[PDB]
Coordinates of C-alpha atoms and ligand atoms in Angstrom, one line a residue:
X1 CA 0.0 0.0 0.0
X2 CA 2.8 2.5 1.1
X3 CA 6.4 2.7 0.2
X4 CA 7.8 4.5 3.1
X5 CA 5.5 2.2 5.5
X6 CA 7.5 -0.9 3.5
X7 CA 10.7 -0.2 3.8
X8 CA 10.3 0.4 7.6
X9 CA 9.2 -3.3 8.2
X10 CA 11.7 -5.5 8.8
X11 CA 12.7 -8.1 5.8
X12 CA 10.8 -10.6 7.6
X13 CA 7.5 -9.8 7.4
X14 CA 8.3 -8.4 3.8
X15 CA 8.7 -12.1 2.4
X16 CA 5.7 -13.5 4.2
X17 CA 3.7 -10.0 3.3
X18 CA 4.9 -10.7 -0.7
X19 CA 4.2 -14.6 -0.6
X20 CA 0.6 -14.1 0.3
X21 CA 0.5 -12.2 -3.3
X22 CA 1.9 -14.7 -5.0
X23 CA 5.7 -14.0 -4.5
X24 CA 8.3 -16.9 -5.4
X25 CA 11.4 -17.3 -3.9
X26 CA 11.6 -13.8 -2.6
X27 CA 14.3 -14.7 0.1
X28 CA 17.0 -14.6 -2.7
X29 CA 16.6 -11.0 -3.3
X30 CA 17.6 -8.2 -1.3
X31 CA 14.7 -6.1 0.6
X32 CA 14.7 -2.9 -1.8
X33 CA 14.3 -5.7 -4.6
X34 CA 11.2 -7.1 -2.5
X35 CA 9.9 -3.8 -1.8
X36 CA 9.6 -3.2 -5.7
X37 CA 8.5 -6.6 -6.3
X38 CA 5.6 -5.8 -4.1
X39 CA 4.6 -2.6 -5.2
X40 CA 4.7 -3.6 -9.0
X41 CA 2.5 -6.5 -8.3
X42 CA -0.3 -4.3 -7.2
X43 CA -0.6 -4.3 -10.9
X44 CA -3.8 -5.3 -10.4
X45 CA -5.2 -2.1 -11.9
X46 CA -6.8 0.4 -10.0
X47 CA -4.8 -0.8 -7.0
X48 CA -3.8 1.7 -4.7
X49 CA -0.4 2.5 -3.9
X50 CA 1.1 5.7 -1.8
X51 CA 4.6 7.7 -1.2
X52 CA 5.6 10.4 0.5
X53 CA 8.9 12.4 1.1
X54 CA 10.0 16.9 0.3
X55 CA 10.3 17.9 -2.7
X56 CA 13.6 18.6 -4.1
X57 CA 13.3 20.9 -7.2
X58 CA 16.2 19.7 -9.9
X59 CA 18.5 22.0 -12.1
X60 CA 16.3 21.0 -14.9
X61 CA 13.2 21.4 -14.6
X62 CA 12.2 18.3 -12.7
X63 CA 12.0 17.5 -9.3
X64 CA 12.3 14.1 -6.0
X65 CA 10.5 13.6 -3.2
X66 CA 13.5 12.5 -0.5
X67 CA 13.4 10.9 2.7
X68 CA 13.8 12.2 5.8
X69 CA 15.7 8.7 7.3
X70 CA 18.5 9.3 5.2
X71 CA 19.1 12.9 5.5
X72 CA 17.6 13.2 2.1
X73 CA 20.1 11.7 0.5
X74 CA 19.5 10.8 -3.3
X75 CA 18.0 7.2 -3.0
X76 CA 17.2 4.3 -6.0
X77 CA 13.7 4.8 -4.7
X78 CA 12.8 8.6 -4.5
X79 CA 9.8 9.8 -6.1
X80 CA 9.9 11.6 -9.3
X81 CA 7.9 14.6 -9.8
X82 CA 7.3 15.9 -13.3
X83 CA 8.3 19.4 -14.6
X84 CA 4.6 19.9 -15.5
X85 CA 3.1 18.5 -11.9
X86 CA 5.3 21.1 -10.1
X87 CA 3.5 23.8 -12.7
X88 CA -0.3 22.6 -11.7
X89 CA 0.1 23.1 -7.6
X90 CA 3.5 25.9 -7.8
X91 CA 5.5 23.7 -6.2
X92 CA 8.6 24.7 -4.3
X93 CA 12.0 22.9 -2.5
X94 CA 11.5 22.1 0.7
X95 CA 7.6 20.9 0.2
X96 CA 6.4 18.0 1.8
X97 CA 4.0 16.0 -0.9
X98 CA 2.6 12.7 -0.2
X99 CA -0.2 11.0 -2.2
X100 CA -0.9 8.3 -4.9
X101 CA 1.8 7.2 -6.7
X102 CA 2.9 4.5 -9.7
X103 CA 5.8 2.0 -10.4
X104 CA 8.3 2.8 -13.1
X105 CA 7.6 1.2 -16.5
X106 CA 9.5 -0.4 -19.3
X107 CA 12.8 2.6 -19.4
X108 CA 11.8 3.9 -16.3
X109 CA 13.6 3.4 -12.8
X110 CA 11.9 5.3 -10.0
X111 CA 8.2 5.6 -9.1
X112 CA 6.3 8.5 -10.1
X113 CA 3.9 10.5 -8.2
X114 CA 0.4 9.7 -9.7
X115 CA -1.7 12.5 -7.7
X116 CA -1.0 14.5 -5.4
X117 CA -3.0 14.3 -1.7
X118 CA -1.2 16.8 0.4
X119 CA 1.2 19.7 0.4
X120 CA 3.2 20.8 3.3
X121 CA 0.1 18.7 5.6
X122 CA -2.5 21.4 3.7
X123 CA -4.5 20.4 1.2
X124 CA -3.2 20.7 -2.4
X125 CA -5.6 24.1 -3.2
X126 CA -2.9 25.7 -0.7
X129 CA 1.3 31.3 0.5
X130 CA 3.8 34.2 -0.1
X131 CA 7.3 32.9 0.6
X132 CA 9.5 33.5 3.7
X133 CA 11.3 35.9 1.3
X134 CA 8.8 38.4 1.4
X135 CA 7.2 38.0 5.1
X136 CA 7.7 41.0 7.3
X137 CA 10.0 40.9 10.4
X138 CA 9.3 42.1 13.6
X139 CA 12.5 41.5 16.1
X140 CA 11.2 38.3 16.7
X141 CA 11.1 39.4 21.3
X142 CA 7.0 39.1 21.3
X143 CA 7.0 35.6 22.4
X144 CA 9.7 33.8 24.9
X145 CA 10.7 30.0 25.0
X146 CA 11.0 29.0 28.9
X147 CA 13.0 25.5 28.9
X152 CA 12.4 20.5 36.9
X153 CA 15.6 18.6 38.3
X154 CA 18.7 18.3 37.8
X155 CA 18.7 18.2 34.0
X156 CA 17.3 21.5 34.2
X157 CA 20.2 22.8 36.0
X158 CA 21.8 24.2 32.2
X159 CA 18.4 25.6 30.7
X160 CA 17.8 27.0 33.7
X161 CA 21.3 28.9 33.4
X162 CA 20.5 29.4 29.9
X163 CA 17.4 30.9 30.2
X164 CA 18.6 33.4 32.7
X165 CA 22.0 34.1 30.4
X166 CA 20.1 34.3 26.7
X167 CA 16.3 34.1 27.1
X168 CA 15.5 32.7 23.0
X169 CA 12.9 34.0 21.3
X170 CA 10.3 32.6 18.5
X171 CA 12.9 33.7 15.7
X172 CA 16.4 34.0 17.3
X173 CA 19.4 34.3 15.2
X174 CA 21.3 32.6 18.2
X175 CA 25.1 31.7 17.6
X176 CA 27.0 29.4 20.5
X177 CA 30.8 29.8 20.7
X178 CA 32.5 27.0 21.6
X179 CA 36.1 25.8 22.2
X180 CA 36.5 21.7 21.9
X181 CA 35.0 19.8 24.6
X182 CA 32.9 22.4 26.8
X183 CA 29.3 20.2 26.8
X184 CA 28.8 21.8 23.2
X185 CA 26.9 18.3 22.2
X186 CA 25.2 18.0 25.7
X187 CA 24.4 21.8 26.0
X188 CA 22.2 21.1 22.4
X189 CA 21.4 17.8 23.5
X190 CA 19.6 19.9 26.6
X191 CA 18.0 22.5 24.3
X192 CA 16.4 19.6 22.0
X193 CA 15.2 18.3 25.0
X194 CA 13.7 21.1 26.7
X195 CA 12.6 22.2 23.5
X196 CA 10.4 18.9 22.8
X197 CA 9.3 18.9 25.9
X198 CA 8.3 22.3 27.0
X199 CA 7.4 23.5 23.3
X200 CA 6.1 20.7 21.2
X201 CA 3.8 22.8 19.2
X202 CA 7.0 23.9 17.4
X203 CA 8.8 22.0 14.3
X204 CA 12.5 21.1 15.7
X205 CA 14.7 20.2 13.3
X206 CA 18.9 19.1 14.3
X207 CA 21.2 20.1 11.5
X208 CA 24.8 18.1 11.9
X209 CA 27.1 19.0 9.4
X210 CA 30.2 16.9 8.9
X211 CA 30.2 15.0 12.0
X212 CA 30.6 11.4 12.9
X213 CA 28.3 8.7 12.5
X214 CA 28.1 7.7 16.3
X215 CA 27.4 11.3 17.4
X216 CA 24.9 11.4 14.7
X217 CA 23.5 8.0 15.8
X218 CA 23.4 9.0 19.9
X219 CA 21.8 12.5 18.5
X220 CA 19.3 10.6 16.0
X221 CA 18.1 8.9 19.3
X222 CA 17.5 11.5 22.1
X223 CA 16.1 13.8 20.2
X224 CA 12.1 14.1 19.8
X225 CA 12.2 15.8 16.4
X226 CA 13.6 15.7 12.9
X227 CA 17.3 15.1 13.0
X228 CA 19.0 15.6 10.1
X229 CA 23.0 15.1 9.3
X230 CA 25.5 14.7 6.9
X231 CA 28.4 12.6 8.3
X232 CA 32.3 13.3 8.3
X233 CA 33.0 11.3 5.3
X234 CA 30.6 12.7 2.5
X235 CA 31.9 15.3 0.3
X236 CA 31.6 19.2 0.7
X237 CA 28.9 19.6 -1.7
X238 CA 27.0 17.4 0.3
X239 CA 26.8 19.3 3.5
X240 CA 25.5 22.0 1.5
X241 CA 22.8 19.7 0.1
X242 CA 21.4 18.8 3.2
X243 CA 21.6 22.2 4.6
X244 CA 19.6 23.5 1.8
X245 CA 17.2 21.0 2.3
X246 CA 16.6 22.2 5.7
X247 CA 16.7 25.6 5.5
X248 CA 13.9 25.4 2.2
X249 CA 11.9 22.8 4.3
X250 CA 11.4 25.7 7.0
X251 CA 10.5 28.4 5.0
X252 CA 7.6 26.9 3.3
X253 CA 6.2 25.5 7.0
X254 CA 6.9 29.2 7.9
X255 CA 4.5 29.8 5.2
X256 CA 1.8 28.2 6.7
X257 CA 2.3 29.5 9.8
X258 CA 4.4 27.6 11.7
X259 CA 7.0 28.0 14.8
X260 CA 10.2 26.2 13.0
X261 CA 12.9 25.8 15.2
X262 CA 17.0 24.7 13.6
X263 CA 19.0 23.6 16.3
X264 CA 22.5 23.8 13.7
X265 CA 25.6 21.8 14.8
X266 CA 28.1 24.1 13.5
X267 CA 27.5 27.4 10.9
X268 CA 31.7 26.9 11.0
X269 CA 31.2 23.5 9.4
X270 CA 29.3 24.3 7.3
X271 CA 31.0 27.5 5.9
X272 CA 33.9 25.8 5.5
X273 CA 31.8 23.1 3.1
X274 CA 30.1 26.1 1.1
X275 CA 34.0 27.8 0.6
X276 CA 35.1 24.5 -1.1
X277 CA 31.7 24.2 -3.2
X278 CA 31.4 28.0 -4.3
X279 CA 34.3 29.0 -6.9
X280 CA 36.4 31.6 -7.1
X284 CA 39.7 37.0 -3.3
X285 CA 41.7 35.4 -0.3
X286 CA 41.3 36.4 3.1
X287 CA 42.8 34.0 5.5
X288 CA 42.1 30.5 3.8
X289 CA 38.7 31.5 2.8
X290 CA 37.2 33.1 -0.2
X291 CA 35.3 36.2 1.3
X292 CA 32.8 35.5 -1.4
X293 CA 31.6 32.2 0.0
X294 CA 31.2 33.4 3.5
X295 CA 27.8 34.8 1.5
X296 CA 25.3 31.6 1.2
X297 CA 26.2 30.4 5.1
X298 CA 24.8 33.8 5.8
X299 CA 22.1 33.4 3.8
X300 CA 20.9 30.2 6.1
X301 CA 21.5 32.2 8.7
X302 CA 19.6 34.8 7.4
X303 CA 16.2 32.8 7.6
X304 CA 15.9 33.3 11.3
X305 CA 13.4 35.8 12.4
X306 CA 10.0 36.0 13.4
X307 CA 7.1 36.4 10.9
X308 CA 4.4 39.3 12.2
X309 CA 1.8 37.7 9.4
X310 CA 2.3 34.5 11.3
X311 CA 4.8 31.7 12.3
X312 CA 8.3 32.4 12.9
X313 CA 12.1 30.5 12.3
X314 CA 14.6 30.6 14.8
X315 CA 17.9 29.4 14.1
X316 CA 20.5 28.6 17.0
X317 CA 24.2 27.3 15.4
X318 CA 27.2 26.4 17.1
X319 CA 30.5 28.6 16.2
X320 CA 33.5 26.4 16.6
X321 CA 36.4 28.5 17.7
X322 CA 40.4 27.7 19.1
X323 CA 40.7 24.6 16.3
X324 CA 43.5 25.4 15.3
X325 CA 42.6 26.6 11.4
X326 CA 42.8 30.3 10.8
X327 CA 40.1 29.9 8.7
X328 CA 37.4 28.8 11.3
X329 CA 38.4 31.8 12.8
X330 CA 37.8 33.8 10.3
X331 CA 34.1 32.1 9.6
X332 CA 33.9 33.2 13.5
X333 CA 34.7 36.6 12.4
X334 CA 32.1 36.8 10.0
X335 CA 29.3 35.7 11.5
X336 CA 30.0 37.8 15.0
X337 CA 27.2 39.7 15.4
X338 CA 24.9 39.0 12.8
X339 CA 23.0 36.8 15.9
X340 CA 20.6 38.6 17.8
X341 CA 21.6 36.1 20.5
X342 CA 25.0 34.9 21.8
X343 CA 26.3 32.1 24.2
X344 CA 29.8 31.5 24.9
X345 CA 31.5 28.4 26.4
X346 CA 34.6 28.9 28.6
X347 CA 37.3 26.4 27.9
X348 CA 38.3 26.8 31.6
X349 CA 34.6 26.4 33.4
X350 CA 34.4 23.0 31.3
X351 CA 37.1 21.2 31.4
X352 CA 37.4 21.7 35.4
X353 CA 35.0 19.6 35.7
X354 CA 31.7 22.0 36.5
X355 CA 29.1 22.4 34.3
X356 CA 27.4 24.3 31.9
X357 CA 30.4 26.1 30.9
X358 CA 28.8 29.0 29.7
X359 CA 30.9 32.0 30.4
X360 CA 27.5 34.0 32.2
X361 CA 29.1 37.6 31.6
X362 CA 29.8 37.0 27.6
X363 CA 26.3 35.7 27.0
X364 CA 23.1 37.3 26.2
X365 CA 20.8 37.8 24.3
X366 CA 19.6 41.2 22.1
X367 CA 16.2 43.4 23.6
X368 CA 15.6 41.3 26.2
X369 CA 12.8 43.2 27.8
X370 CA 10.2 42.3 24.8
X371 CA 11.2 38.4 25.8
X372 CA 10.3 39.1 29.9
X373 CA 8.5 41.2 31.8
X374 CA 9.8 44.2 33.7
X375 CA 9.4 42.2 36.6
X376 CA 11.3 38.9 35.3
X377 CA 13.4 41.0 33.5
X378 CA 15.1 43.4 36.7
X379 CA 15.3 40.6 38.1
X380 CA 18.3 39.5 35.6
X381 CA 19.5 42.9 36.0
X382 CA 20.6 43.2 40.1
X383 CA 22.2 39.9 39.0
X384 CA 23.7 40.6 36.2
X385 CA 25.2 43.5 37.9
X386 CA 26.5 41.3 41.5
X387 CA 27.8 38.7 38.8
X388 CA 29.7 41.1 36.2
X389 CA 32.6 41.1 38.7
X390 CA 32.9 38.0 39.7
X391 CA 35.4 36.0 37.8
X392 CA 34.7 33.3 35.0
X393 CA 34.8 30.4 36.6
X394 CA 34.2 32.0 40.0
X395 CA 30.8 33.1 38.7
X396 CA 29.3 29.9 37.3
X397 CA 29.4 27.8 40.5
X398 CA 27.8 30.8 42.3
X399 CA 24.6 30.3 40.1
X400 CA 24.9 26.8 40.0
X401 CA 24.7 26.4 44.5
X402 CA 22.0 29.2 44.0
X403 CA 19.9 27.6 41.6
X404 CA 19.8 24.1 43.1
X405 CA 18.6 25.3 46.3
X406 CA 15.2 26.5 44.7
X407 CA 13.5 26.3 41.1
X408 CA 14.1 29.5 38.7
X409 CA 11.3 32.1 39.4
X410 CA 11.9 31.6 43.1
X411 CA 15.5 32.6 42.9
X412 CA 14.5 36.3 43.7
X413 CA 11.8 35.3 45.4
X414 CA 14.0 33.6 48.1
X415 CA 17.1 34.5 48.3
X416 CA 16.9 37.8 48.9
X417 CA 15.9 37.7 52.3
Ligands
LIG1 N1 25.0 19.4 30.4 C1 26.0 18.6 30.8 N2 25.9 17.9 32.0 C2 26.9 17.1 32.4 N3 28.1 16.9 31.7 C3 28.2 17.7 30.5 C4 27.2 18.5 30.0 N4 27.7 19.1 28.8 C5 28.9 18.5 28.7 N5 29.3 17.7 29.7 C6 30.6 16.9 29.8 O1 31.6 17.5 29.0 C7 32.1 16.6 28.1 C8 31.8 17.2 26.7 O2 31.5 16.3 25.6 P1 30.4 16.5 24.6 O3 29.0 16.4 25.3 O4 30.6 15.4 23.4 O5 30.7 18.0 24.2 P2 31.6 18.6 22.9 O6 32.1 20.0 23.4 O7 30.6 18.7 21.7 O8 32.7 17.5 22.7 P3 33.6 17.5 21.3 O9 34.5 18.8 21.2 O10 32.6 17.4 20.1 S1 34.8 15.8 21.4 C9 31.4 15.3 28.3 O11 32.3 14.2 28.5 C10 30.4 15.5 29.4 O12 30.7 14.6 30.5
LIG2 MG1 30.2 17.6 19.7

């Protein structure tokens, strides 16, 4: 009946789904082979069968549907879309179709959508792009993110209170709970806020990290592993960032948790040609900004917010320079102390360097003073001198109360 439900049940049940229709011998063929097998036979006309998957517009003309559980990554059984389907519903990259579709005949190789049921979970009759939506700051509406898991968001929320469209960059130096400090956010963010669309972008990272991230997260986590080539992590990236913009067009809170805006700058230098300024072409620096350009929130509705990871002290000049660039372009910093971390205390956000940009349409005057008379008895205090002062004042209490009881 449907491809995407197919291939997600196990081999097993695929032969002794397959045999019941008349299959032969199917166990000496691999499972996509079975999966195809199956589908073609419902080649008893008038015979339903379904895909879905976001639409990937071609160079051409023409266009694919791609999965989600590979990272979109170009597969022998995407769905094609014709040049003249895309013209009948104004079809766009980043579009999530799903609906009827039909096996590949004699010359063809890939199934072909047949009718389409749904676009971006509206139906088809359904929108002027994220590139023309007005932007208000993107303050009106905070994202709050209890135990001892809520010991960093509850830092974090004091440091940089996020907004419903934050440009939010996180500097980090190597090993400073960078993975676990996103690992937080995704789960504060899923479970404090799951009317929003979360969506993990991991650019050029390693298959484990990818695999431990692909599991605690409640949301759409998308990577592209250390291994594949540069104009790959700019593929999946692409994906992502049009994927958002048309759920933004309906309205919708999207929220881009990004591993690294440095990895991916460093992808989009080797993929755009042809101007030197410290390893990187200051030309290239021009598309990783235009990702990070997205984030903002929509006053005709919905909003994209966009929090990336800066990697800094690498040891390439050039990751400096992609630091550089992108410094201030967030309306929303946090930096990690190399120091605070690896002393073994945690979150090592360095509380003076962090914050976030007109904080007072995120909090009330009331919440809002009340980071203020901190902020001013903490400013003094040294980096690491700091951070276990909030952490023993914090974990005798649970946020709001803070002011509320120790003041005395
Ligand atoms: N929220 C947290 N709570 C407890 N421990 C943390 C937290 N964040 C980081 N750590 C510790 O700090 C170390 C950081 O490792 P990761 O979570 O992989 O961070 P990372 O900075 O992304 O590491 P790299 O540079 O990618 S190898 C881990 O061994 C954790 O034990
Ligand atoms: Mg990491």
């Amino acid at each position: 009946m449907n491809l995407t439900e197919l291939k997600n049940t196990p081999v097993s049940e695929l032969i002794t789904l397959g045999e019941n229709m008349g299959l032969e011998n199917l166990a000496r063929m691999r499972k996509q082979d079975i999966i195809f097998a199956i589908l073609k036979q419902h080649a008893k006309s008038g015979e339903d069968i379904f895909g879905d998957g976001v639409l990937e517009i071609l160079q051409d003309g023409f266009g694919f549907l791609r999965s989600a559980d590979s990272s979109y990554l170009a597969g022998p059984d995407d769905i094609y879309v014709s040049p003249s389907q895309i013209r009948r519903f104004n079809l766009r990259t980043g579009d999530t179709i799903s609906g009827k579709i039909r096996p590949p005949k004699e010359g063809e190789r890939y199934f072909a959508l047949l009718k389409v049921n749904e676009v971006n979970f509206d139906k088809p009759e359904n929108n002027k792009i994220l590139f023309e939506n007005l932007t208000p700051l993107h303050a009106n509406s905070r994202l709050r993110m209890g135990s001892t898991e809520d010991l960093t968001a509850r830092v974090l929320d004091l440091a940089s209170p996020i907004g419903r469209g934050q440009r939010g960059l996180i500097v980090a130096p190597p090993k400073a709970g960078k993975t676990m400090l996103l690992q937080n956010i995704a789960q504060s963010i899923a479970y404090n806020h799951p009317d929003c669309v979360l969506m993990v972008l991991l650019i050029d990272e390693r298959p484990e990290e990818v695999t431990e991230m692909q599991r605690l997260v409640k949301g759409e986590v998308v990577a592209s592993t250390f291994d594949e080539p540069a104009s790959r992590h700019v593929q999946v990236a692409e994906m992502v960032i049009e994927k958002a913009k048309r759920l933004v067009e309906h309205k919708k809170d999207v929220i881009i948790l990004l591993d690294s805006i440095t990895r991916l700058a460093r992808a989009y230098n080797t993929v755009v040609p042809a101007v030197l300024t410290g390893g990187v072409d200051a030309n290239a620096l021009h598309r990783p900004k235009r990702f990070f350009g997205a984030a903002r929130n929509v006053e005709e509705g919905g909003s994209l917010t966009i929090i990336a990871t800066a990697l800094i002290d690498t040891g390439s000049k050039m990751d400096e320079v992609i630091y550089e660039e992108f410094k201030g372009t967030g309306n929303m910093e946090l930096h990690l102390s190399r120091k605070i971390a690896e002393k073994r205390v945690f979150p090592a956000i360095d509380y003076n360097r962090s914050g976030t940009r007109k904080e007072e349409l995120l909090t009330t005057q009331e919440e809002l003073q009340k980071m203020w008379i901190l902020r001013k008895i903490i400013h003094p205090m040294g980096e690491i001198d700091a951070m276990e002062f909030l952490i023993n004042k914090l974990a005798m209490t649970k946020t709001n109360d803070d002011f509320f009881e120790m003041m005395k």
